[PDB]
Amino acid sequence: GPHSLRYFDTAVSRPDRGEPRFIEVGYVDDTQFVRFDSDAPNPRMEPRAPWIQQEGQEYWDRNTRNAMGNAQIYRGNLRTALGYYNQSEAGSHTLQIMYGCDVGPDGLLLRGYSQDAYDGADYIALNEDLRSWTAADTAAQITKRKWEAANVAEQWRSYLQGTCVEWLQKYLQMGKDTLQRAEPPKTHVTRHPSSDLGVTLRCWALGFYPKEISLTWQREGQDQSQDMELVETRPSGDGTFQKWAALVVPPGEEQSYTCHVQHEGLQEPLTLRWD
């Protein structure tokens, strides 16, 4: 299917420290592969997956110069963000940046990103067309004015359409065994009765990759909702994911309901019942 290369950048003004701490993580799809933290005395870009370790020195040196680069920019943007809002030197502040490319099954660019948030709220963002910016308020609208004259949009566009996309392909090649595995869920249903009041059936999916999965409960064709608890999909800690969907059903009727599991790593959809 489609794939993505995404960097998640967090700069935090301490401010009982001369510098704010910069953290960057890089992902292909839902797998992390690189890391930069400003709080190392050596601070370099580091591998966080075995399949990136084959890159040679120049890959690590270029990444480190760029993260050094962007850390000093974001520090600057922290200082700038105080005055554009009349703000207290006492309080700690957060700048987040997400940028990356999202690419289709044939390698076309579908969506490119560069976007920013000050203390959890939009600030500025590159538009779907990568030729314009939407600024969240008057503070950001001046930053925009500056980025407009600078034609930084063209700098992002060119990165997102060349570098970002070409490297994503490379990463999908190098990490093939990890990133292109279609690893199916391991499934089972539990039952937990509750007096004579009906019965919690919980359908589980463990050990799957990628992240996207559908768990639904049906009876007589119809998806159920009423005492239907669905947890947020969650990392298992070994590159795989887990989730579950639980439904309260009447006593005696356990077998009228079926859990429907849809995943990339399954030949065809799966239908479970409690036994």
Binding site: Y7, E24, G26, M45, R62, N63, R65, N66, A67, G69, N70, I73, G76, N77, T80, Y99, S114, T143, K146, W147, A150, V152, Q155, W156, Y159, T163, C164, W167
Partner: peptide
């Protein structure tokens, strides 16, 4: 690959 961009703000 990370981006090398660039402008003051």
């Amino acid at each position: 690959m990370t981006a090398h961009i660039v402008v003051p703000y």
